[PDB]
Amino acid sequence: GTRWAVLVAGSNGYGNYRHQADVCHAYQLLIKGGVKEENIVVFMYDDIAYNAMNPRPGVIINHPQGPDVYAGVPKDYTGEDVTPENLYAVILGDKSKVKGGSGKVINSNPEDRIFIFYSNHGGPGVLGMPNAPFVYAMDFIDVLKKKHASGGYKEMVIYIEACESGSIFEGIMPKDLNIYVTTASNAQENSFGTYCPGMNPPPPEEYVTCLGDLYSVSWMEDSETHNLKRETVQQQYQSVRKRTSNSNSYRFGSHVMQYGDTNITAEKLYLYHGFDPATVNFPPHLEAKMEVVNQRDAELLFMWQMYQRSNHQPEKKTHILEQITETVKHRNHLDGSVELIGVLLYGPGKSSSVLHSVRAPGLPLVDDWTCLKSMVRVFETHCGSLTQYGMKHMRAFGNVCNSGVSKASMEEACKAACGGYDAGLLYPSNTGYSA
Amino acid sequence: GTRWAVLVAGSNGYGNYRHQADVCHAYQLLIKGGVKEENIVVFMYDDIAYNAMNPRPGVIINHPQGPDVYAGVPKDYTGEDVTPENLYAVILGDKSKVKGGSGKVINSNPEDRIFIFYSNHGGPGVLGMPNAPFVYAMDFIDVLKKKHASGGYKEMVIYIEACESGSIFEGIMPKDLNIYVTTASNAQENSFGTYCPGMNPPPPEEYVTCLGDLYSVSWMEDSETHNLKRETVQQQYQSVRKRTSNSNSYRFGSHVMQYGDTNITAEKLYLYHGFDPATVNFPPHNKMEVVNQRDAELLFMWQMYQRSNQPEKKTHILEQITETVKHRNHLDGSVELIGVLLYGPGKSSSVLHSVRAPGLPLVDDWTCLKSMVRVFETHCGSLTQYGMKHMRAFGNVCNSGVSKASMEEACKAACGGYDAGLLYPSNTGYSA
Questions:
Q1: Which of A314, B18, B406, B413 has its CA 20 to 30 A from that of B265?
Q2: Do B414 and A325 touch (CB under 8 A)?
Q3: Do B318 and A344 touch (CB under 8 A)?
Q4: What is the span of the domain harbouring residue A393?
Q5: DSSP string, B333-358
Q6: Are A276 and A346 within one domain?
Q7: What cystine linkages occur within this chain (chain B)?
């Protein structure tokens, strides 16, 4: 049949240039590959092209030397339309459940293939969207199975760039939906950015943000450097796994995972990424270890790079320093509050172990996903908006749900923990609830 | 020549029952070995024996079953007198530097042996006192040097129970002062309390606190249950190591260490701990659940919370627990942020928290450490005994040639606006 594709950047701000770069680069591969713009629905906040801090206005890149990937990207769903509702609508094929954006869904037929590339971000069982709410794993998987029952695709491939991305699929993703998934990381470790200001694969001087992500950059460079009619899904995965682990040193890399129907791994790659005619006569099938940045560190390293640039504007400089100390104060409040809530619910001898214990690979994060969202609303109402950072704390919330704590107990613990602290503008009654 | 001793508990409150009990116990032993009351100086706040929460008023135990250790322990230095300046005066034998207390000191002679035991907690290069200021490794070592320059003894043994007690001697203890030292832990791990409410060798059901400390209770139990006229210093060390290590020494026990002149190891323990004459028909040879010292005070506050399941006072326990944690997060939080304003988010952590290799001093400039602690406390609040854990952070800020000026700038932005209530050095006194 025909190839459709969803591309999603779950991020915002020039700090997260790489996620919007990633989905922009992705669009171009599928264009060069004979996937038609008709059938590509690009989500992206779209605040990078004309960011005051973009030294090339109108131009996004995804390689230190790479060309523009912006020129041609449809503004399908930008700004506050980058929502889990619109994603689930766009995926299913239902324009009568989309709010805003350019009406484009995946109205696909049983003989078609869909490719999904996510990039930003993530925590345990949660994926970033620029604005609350976030994506929760069971919600995502539930859409996928709903789509299978509609007989809306033949086979699907999903690539998730995000921190602890494994946690979206482990113990909840069936292998009978004709869907195959790869994730930048397992369900308990950081993903990374490359092409970062002062790093071994160096970007241009003018660039103070990471241009791409180790995982994302790894598969897109792979697909554009090979005959996709010749190479298999499986060959790609095993090339992306090596590059993303930096030769199995996991201090500076992550474990690229496989989930769903592993039969899809025998298929030629062009069924999903199309065929670039230029790629005929390319090597069918050993690279230097790329210097990287912890995705959770990046957005703070960026604020610091500006602080050191902005020396000779003590007016503007001290606005950065203010923004930094505000961010870290909220980072520290959130971390500290979770900890105390643990102490109040389980006592201070066993609270850490209960909050931060990771289940065995293949068991799901939570057992009741309704409770997870419930606990998260309670937390935010009393303690403040998680922000994207607070996604790290989902295991905590999930592990509360797993310990069978009553909503009331979680209410008092939060009320006790936070009732006395002033979050400022960062409250769910301004920024909306994460769940 | 006569034997002398100095026993110091560095902590306060019913929560730290272990430490005043460790030293009381120690005194009773030393007396039992014929060391006189007039030769032993005792530092204890003295807030345990007649404490509301004591199920046995006027009594103190350092064992689930074992007897009163409080009976007749001298009240040489108690309350606000348990000060670094009194500790140094006493050890030096200097009556003119002593403020308050009995005015008992160690005026030992060139042929006299001395035993120093301390219990509470600590952090990198700092030992606790019930009130600020605390004890800094260099000032302690300095005093030990000075005492030896005046030949106020033949040989000296020093036992130190405290978190990261290795940091007090590593890099700054000479081996040529005729002083042997064991610590309860290396320079970067935690020491433990034992005989605790829930734990495996249980205390009396009546007690809501730990009764002793593993290393303290190990050496003292070893000494009172062995003919010390046969047992070596070295032999006790090994016995205390193996038990203090417990099952796992990295995280469940700790690494009992040795510093200074290791010839004292050869000698018979009776030279320092005396000879218990009811241990002649006593042989020369011979796992238990424990609480990390840093967390004992919350296990105590909780164990109290679960003994009110009795309202009105129950809510006041949770009022304290949260106020305690709230401030413990402020400090942890403040330290991180100061490191991000000095070094940026890339370095900050690696710089603050990096542990030098053994036999290296914690800090090169101690007067700098002292200053940075004061800058912090002025802007951010009293470290309290908890905040001693941040001493390597401050040590690491000094070691990176940072200015008082920039440290003052970082703290001001870090803590500007934060309301520590009455936990400011203007109320509590500066920790240094």
A1: B18
A2: yes
A3: yes
A4: 310-431
A5: HHHHHHHHHHHHHHHHHHHHH----T
A6: no
A7: 196-210, 368-398, 380-415
